[PDB]
Amino acid sequence: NAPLKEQKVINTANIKTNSKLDLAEYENGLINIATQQFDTESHVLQLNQYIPEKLIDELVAKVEAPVLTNIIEQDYFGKNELSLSGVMIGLAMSSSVSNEEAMSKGTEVAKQLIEAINKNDKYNKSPITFAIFKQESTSSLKNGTYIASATVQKNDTNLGNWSTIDEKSYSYPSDEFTQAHGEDNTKINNFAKEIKGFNGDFIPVNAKVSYKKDQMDTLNMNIVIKYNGKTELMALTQLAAQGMLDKLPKDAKVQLQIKSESKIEAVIIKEKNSDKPFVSFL
Amino acid sequence: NAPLKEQKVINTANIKTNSKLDLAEYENGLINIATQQFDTESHVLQLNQYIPEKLIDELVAKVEAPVLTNIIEQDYFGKNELSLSGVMIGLAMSSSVSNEEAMSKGTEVAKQLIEAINKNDKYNKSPITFAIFKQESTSSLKNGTYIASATVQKNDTNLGNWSTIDEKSYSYPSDEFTQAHGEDNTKINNFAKEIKGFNGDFIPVNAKVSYKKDQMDTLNMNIVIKYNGKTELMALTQLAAQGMLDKLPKDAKVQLQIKSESKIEAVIIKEKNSDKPFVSFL
Numbered sequence: 045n046a047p048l049k050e051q052k053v054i055n056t057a058n059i060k061t062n063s064k065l066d067l068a069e070y071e072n073g074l075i076n077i078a079t080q081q082f083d084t085e086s087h088v089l090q091l092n093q094y095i096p097e098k099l100i101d102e103l104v105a106k107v108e109a110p111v112l113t114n115i116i117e118q119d120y121f122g123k124n125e126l127s128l129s130g131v132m133i134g135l136a137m138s139s140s141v142s143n144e145e146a147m148s149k150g151t152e153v154a155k156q157l158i159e160a161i162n163k164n165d166k167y168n169k170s171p172i173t174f175a176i177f178k179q180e181s182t183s184s185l186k187n188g189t190y191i192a193s194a195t196v197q198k199n200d201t202n203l204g205n206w207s208t209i210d211e212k213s214y215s216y217p218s219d220e221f222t223q224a225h226g227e228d229n230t231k232i233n234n235f236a237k238e239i240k241g242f243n244g245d246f247i248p249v250n251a252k253v254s255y256k257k258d259q260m261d262t263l264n265m266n267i268v269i270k271y272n273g274k275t276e277l278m279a280l281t282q283l284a285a286q287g288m289l290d291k292l293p294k295d296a297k298v299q300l301q302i303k304s305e306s307k308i309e310a311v312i313i314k315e316k317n318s319d320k321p322f323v324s325f326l
Numbered sequence: 327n328a329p330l331k332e333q334k335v336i337n338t339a340n341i342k343t344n345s346k347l348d349l350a351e352y353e354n355g356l357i358n359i360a361t362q363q364f365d366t367e368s369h370v371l372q373l374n375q376y377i378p379e380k381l382i383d384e385l386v387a388k389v390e391a392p393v394l395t396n397i398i399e400q401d402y403f404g405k406n407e408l409s410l411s412g413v414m415i416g417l418a419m420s421s422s423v424s425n426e427e428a429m430s431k432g433t434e435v436a437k438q439l440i441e442a443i444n445k446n447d448k449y450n451k452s453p454i455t456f457a458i459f460k461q462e463s464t465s466s467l468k469n470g471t472y473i474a475s476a477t478v479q480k481n482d483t484n485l486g487n488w489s490t491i492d493e494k495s496y497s498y499p500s501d502e503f504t505q506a507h508g509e510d511n512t513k514i515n516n517f518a519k520e521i522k523g524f525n526g527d528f529i530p531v532n533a534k535v536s537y538k539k540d541q542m543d544t545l546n547m548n549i550v551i552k553y554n555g556k557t558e559l560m561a562l563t564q565l566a567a568q569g570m571l572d573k574l575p576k577d578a579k580v581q582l583q584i585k586s587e588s589k590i591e592a593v594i595i596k597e598k599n600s601d602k603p604f605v606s607f608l
Contacts, residue, residue: 045590046467046583046590046593046608047467047590047592047593047606047607047608048465048466048467048606049464049465049466049467049606050606052464052465053464055337055340055341056341058337059337059338065347065349067347067349067350068349068350068599071600072599072600072601075600075601075602076601078602079601084602085568086564086568087564088560088563088564088567088605089567089602089603089604089605090604090605090606090607091604091606121560121564125557125561126557126560126561126564182331182334182335183330183331183334184330184331185328185329185330185331275407275408278370278403278408279407279408281370282368282369282370282403282408285370285371286367286368295599301328308327308328308329310329311328311329316599317350317354317577317598317599318353318354318357319354319357319358319361320357320360320366320371321371322371322372322373323370323371323372324329324330324331324332324372324373325329325372326328326329
């Protein structure tokens with residue numbers, strides 16, 4: 045008999061709201077926020093130590109018309125000898141609500157958790173950081189993402205301001221991006237040179253490129269071309285798909301929308317770590 | 327209006343059977359099987375082109391006591407000009423059944439899909455490969471995994487033998503492993519040297535190491551030590567956790583069970599691509 049997974053996810057609220065779990069993003073994004081807040085280097089990570097299961101059930105699974113769809117708890121222990129340093133809580137917010145309604149629900153939910161985490165006598169009054177995971181819906185190609193964090197100070201109970209997720213973003217091409225991340229800019233330039241094959245004619249590529257902890261996180265590219273049927277557009281999606289694998293960091297989320305005549309005609313997606321990109325047509 | 331995700335996952339059968347989705351593994355594992363079967367290099371990947379949604383609903387969501395919990399369809403197009411080369415179908419099998427009951431259900435389900443995929447006139451009679459994703463349950467630390475594949479030949483309908491997933495496995499330490507993967511063996515040796523810090527005394531590490539397409543896939547390690555309380559075991563989990571990050575490939579699943587006195591006392595897990603490992607105690 046081996047110790048059990050102490051962090052379980054509910055699927056009910058996701059069904060009711062047609063929201064993707066996106067577990068990888070929901071877990072990992074929260075780990076990233078932790079490393080922002082302190083030098084996580086040393087700490088040992090444990091899951092779900094202080095919030096009662098019945099309470100999570102209460103707040104997630106027993107609501108007829110839910111907005112909150114999950115709660116995950118990440119507890120970090122560091123040092124005179126290993127004890128608790130901070131708690132991170134990922135609150136999953138449904139695809140149907142706005143970012144503001146997500147924040148509103150966020151405040152409500154967090155007050156209740158602060159209250160409960162403090163009644164647990166094992167808890168050493170460490171800072172608590174709530175982060176909002178804004179979910180995308182089951183028919184959307186985009187992944188859910190973290191949109192705000194708020195923290196409670198050590199030995200306190202009042203929740204801080206909702207704060208932006210540390211993320212620097214860039215436009216491509218831009219002088220700013222080029223000086224900030226030359227070698228990556230060169231990679232995208234190389235990418236663009238691959239699709240040029242679709243008779244040597246240059247094809248302008250536009251992009252938003254965001255970074256978390258200085259490495260490329262997500263790369264959203266757009267191209268606008270003239271529609272010559274599906275056959276042509278297929279050949280182009282293969283040239284582009286391959287070029288994402290050959291030229292772009294595998295640990296980044298890459299998206300390419302192919303537009304024409306005020307329409308998105310195809311989208312290529314290589315998710316955070318995906319062995320191979322997939323194509324969807326309009 | 328952007329094209330939609332055409333591959334949606336059901337959560338109902340997973341609820342009923344207390345089974346983890348493990349979406350990353352379920353998708354990516356199937357991509358890996360594809361690359362085994364052909365030089366996927368060129369091909370363009372599209373999702374869910376031939377199986378009707380209503381049929382998936384029928385086979386997954388309408389069964390009172392399900393064994394099959396999802397069906398995903400991956401369609402590969404390659405070349406005189408881009409058309410279909412092969413279909414890959416991942417069948418999700420519940421945590422409660424045995425591998426044999428999974429295969430049994432597998433055969434049943436596949437016959438029905440072969441029948442349906444052939445009625446779709448757009449389908450060019452390409453080979454179809456069914457693979458079984460054997461799910462772990464919601465309270466298990468292990469990830470679901472692919473356990474068998476069976477293929478239907480081009481222009482045919484009869485299902486082939488269930489076949490092992492191409493995966494070479496090794497024991498550590500062993501002479502075999504050392505000659506097959508020296509540099510990786512050195513990495514594990516380095517890992518072991520890190521936990522030696524827990525006063526310079528050697529600690530034997532045992533492992534199973536599996537590979538898919540020649541790179542380390544999963545690394546299951548065991549150590550058996552003497553129990554000196556939780557405080558000591560914590561310090562050791564931090565030394566080990568850090569050592570997984572410092573010394574072991576991030577694109578591998580790493581697990582370390584710490585045993586003592588015929589008991590698994592703690593388990594450290596760094597999932598396929600995890601920013602940081604987590605610890606569970608008995």
